[PDB]
Amino acid sequence: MKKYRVQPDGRFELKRFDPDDTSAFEGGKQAALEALAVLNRRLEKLQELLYAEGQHKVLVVLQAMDAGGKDGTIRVVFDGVNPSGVRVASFGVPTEQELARDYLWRVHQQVPRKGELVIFNRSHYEDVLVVRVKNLVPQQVWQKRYRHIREFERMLADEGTTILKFFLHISKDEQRQRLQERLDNPEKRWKFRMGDLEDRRLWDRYQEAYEAAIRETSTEYAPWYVIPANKNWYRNWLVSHILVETLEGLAMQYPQIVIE
Amino acid sequence: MKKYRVQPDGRFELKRFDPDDTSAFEGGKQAALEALAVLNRRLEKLQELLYAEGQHKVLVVLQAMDAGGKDGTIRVVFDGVNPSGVRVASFGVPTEQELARDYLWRVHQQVPRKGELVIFNRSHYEDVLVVRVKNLVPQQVWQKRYRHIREFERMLADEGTTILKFFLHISKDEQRQRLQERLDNPEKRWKFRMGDLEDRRLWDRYQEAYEAAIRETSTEYAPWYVIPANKNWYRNWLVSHILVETLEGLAMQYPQPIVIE
Amino acid sequence: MKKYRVQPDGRFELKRFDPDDTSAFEGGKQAALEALAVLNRRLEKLQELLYAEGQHKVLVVLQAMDAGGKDGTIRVVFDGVNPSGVRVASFGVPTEQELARDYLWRVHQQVPRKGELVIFNRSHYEDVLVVRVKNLVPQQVWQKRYRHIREFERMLADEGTTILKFFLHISKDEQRQRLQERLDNPEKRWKFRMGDLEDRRLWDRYQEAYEAAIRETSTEYAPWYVIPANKNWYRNWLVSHILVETLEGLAMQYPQIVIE
Amino acid sequence: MKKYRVQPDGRFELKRFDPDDTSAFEGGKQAALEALAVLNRRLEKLQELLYAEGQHKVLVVLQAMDAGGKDGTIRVVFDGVNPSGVRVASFGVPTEQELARDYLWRVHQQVPRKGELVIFNRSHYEDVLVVRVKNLVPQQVWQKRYRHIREFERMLADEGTTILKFFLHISKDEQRQRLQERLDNPEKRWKFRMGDLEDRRLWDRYQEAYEAAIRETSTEYAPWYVIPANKNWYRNWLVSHILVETLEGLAMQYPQPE
Ligand SMILES: Nc1ncnc2c1ncn2[C@@H]1O[C@H](COP(=O)(O)OP(=O)(O)O)[C@@H](O)[C@H]1O
Ligand SMILES: Nc1ncnc2c1ncn2[C@@H]1O[C@H](COP(=O)(O)OP(=O)(O)O)[C@@H](O)[C@H]1O
Ligand SMILES: Nc1ncnc2c1ncn2[C@@H]1O[C@H](COP(=O)(O)OP(=O)(O)O)[C@@H](O)[C@H]1O
Ligand SMILES: Nc1ncnc2c1ncn2[C@@H]1O[C@H](COP(=O)(O)OP(=O)(O)O)[C@@H](O)[C@H]1O
Ligand SMILES: [Cl-]
Ligand SMILES: [Mg+2]
Ligand SMILES: [Mg+2]
Ligand SMILES: [Mg+2]
Ligand SMILES: [Mg+2]
DSSP: OGGGBOOSSSOOOGGGOOTTOOTTSSSOHHHHHHHHHHHHHHHHHHHHHHHHHOOOEEEEEEEESTTSSHHHHHHHHTTTSOTTTEEEEEOOSOOHHHHTSOTTHHHHHTOOOTTOEEEEESOGGGGGTHHHHTTSSOHHHHTTHHHHHHHHHHHHHHTTEEEEEEEEEOOHHHHHHHHHHHHSOTTTGGGOOTHHHHHHHTHHHHHHHHHHHHHHHOOSSSOEEEEEOSSHHHHHHHHHHHHHHHHHHTOOOOOOOOOO | OTTSBOOSSSOOOGGGOOTTOOTTSSSOHHHHHHHHHHHHHHHHHHHHHHHHHOOOEEEEEEEESTTSSHHHHHHHHTTTOOGGGEEEEEOOSOOHHHHTSOTTHHHHHTOOOTTOEEEEESOGGGGGTHHHHTTSSOHHHHTTHHHHHHHHHHHHHHTTEEEEEEEEEOOHHHHHHHHHHHTTOTTTTTTOOTTHHHHHHTHHHHHHHHHHHHHHHOOSSSOEEEEEOSSHHHHHHHHHHHHHHHHHHTOOOOOOOOOOO | OOSSBOOSSSOOOGGGSOTTOOTTSSSOHHHHHHHHHHHHHHHHHHHHHHHHHOOOEEEEEEEESTTSSHHHHHHHHTTTSOGGGEEEEEOOSOOHHHHTSOTTHHHHHTOOOTTOEEEEESOGGGGTTHHHHTTSSOHHHHTTHHHHHHHHHHHHHHTTEEEEEEEEEOOHHHHHHHHHHHHHOTTTGGGOOTHHHHHHHTHHHHHHHHHHHHHHHOOSSSOEEEEEOSSHHHHHHHHHHHHHHHHHHTOOOOOOOOOO | OTTSBOOSSSOOOGGGOOTTOOTTSSSOHHHHHHHHHHHHHHHHHHHHHHHHHOOOEEEEEEEESTTSSHHHHHHHHTTTSOGGGEEEEEOOSOOHHHHTSOTTHHHHTTOOOTTOEEEEESOGGGGGTHHHHTTSSOHHHHTTHHHHHHHHHHHHHHTTEEEEEEEEEOOHHHHHHHHHHHHHOTTTGGGOOTHHHHHHHTHHHHHHHHHHHHHHHOOSSSOEEEEEOSSHHHHHHHHHHHHHHHHHHTOOOOOOOO
8 A cells, every 4th residue: 555655755746646546445435435444443443542642643634636535534534533532623714813923833833742633634735735826925935845844744753743644636527526516515515615616727736736745745754645536435445544554553552459 | 301401590409410310211221322323413414514604603511520421421422523523622730821820711712613513521610619629729719700600601602602511410339330440441540540539538529519510600591401420321312412402403504605617 | 090090880971081181290291201210110120029929910901092002102101121021912803713713712812921911902892892883793792792891801800810901092183193193204104004094984983982891891800091191291101100009009029058 | 243153064162152251342331331222222213113014023042051141131132122012932841731742832832923023031942951951851852853943943034034042151150159149139039949059060061052052053044142141231232232233134114105
């Protein structure tokens, strides 16, 4: 499953990853759901170790094109995981208070504490994504941010954070269908804003911004994983597999008279 | 079912509530687990609505004697509920930073935002519970806090927060059993604190504190519910039933705001 | 003196206070500057004691019509007072993050800690002032906020905060000059916004809103002081006098071997 | 006066700086007080411009041995500077909440916003000073923090923060005198705690930690200035001079009318 980890060699090409690829799983939807159920139970048990051990900090970063599966991933991968140990931090349009400090200030506040698993639904990456695509700052400014990010993540990792960054990779046609389904669904119509169409006109610019971001910031201490995400069953299984394998590697353990 | 809601008449008596009572459910463990499963799936759907609508703020307060079932309630009642819309805020021993401001400062920071459901695992109530029982401040100080709490909760309710306060009611013997079990299971021995034996010695002073707190702060806008909690199946079913009924009462609606090329 | 303290009898009338009144000081500008210098030194010494003792919390609330003297007051009254123990919290246009919680959430965060003196340059009062005048919430909502404020302040006072609320009272004509002077001064033009003309146009609505807010919230534990503020020398002297006397009343004490 | 700026060449030696040196000022205490009053007035005007312009963020870091003059510097250098635009963030013993996140979390929280001047009375540097001296984390951990600090400061500078870091340099004998004076003055005894004496026993370890920290983190974007601080008048004048010169270099402008 190591074929999805982006090596720190600055030679990453997004074209080498197909959103419709399901090659790491030897079967289809039904076999994958059973396999996911097994991983989800292991994940619940690994989160229990993390929380009780209270040493490690786990950071899961989710990034994708609009309708790329960020909410779906959280919902399904973390299903049944103790709410006391799992937290979501969503990053939207910066406020005036947030813009008055460096772009990393609002992000650094939300980092996981010891024994905690945090999911960034969007992140500090938006500052080299939407900011780059829509030229919210000049190139001279945002080009320097790749180093800021590598060094911020190095500090986090050195200080005890396990970082997993998932790029949920969907195709242009898959986004068109998901966006259309969001229009033609009254319980999902709320997720759709008009702005989702302008970001859609900028598809290629966003793909280029993603490629450069992933190429510049995938490191040994903070890897990027490209998740083919056109098939939700595959996306959910693969994210769970990578997460569970990473947590297993930490080799966490539980810590070390008659009541009247 | 809402015979468990404490009326704002200042006549609340904890003796009228039996921790072993299961009278609101016409059956036992197995039927209640099926009933809970149904409520849990309704809760998942009601949370999706709350988040989507993004107007209401939901605050669930959990208070109990040690080993009274606070963690158990969170894990079971909120099982499968989207992590993006549900948050737990735990209140422990105040830090120097927290003590340097009023007791409500650390609590007010954690309140739910619009479209969010927040669980207070312990709360601002500890400032009329452990503080009163262990005399951390004089009576002159903590007696004034019942009003502070009523008025803080009124402000929260008026400004859009739906407040549900659950007192998970267990018996003295049930506590004896639960701490003993926790002090035996090696995967749970980490939960046990030596301080739990001094708090058990003050059982009666904590029961009196709870009675006073519940009597003083159960209001129309922020009710207290006494949950008989010796039977976990009953405690989980009843908390889910009360929560689901409350969210259904909000009559939440999905927002309403072309061919993609 | 106590002639400026608004009694908690719900009979407050702003008309009884003249912005041009200087009756509490037996002299003019020059004698009051010397008197202010004496109070300012006492204030520096009282702040040093407050910080050292580290037990009391002091909250100074400043409210006024636009150009009413809030900045001028901070600058002059707190001149030379140690920056380590004096903090300003300015309340501007609420952000989306701030609006997503109750109006008191952003305000409660900024309250003074033990040994600290905090100045609210605008405050939670804006939630019964601009909010009321411009109908940012319905009357049914903001009318309930007077009680919220009394009860919030009661809690603060009961828990150890000394609360002083100053309404810097200027006349309509004094504001017209000050606003105009702000337009004509290139080192002050930045303070002017087009919205200030809308706020000037609503003078009477704001005066009504101030009268109702002062009448509803001036209590024994959190008094309002109406400061005639057309004369800056008088405004600065009177605010310093009230503050110094209040801090002296606290009877603060300093907390209580050969080096090799 | 560029003799006090630590060049980014990794060759810094604290022994080359005398706490009793006053060579940059051609006079004594009384002429310096007048000179300081002139600089203080310029500083009040530069702060007004910073706040009005609302674009730059100014970070002043103060580090010293105990009784080295951090509070005195804040009090005198920033005397009369508008409280609305100047803020002090003091860094003490980390709480359990603070220790549960990386050491930079509590520090990053306090960084200046646009139009603001912030003074760090102690800072993120403590995490390579007291932490190193008392081995609160192993060497393997704190040795990596010099890079974290350079890169955190680079990010801050690139994103619009002007950083000035002042090491207020006093001698071992000056600290003995000042610590004694603190125990004898009843309005200053509160500043003294017993721990300050074990910190004095560890004088040499702290001097080595300071030398290493300054050598590792003095950069073009975030320089360290060694301030001979045995003479308060000289320390106050020199810090004001460096600060005023730095702010003047920003060539701040009042906002363009609407
Ligand atoms: N740093 C940033 N700068 C500008 N816009 C940002 C930044 N971070 C996030 N955003 C934007 O905030 C929006 C969040 O969208 P939203 O509908 O609330 O959530 P999501 O689409 O992830 O479910 C996106 O349009 C995203 O581009
Ligand atoms: N306001 C407060 N003042 C004093 N102690 C408090 C306060 N709030 C909470 N506590 C105490 O903090 C402790 C939290 O216990 P902990 O083991 O961390 O969690 P829990 O037992 O709820 O699982 C309890 O002993 C509780 O009495
Ligand atoms: N609660 C609030 N709701 C709406 N607007 C607010 C609120 N609090 C403050 N404001 C507004 O924020 C603005 C702050 O103005 P600004 O020019 O930044 O400062 P000031 O005029 O006090 O020097 C004012 O127009 C004020 O009415
Ligand atoms: N990162 C840190 N780790 C450990 N101790 C720290 C840290 N930061 C600051 N401290 C300690 O906190 C204490 C603050 O001392 P205090 O008397 O409150 O202030 P000061 O001496 O600066 O006036 C010092 O002993 C300092 O070493
Ligand atoms: Cl699917
Ligand atoms: Mg969207
Ligand atoms: Mg204005
Ligand atoms: Mg904000
Ligand atoms: Mg000290």
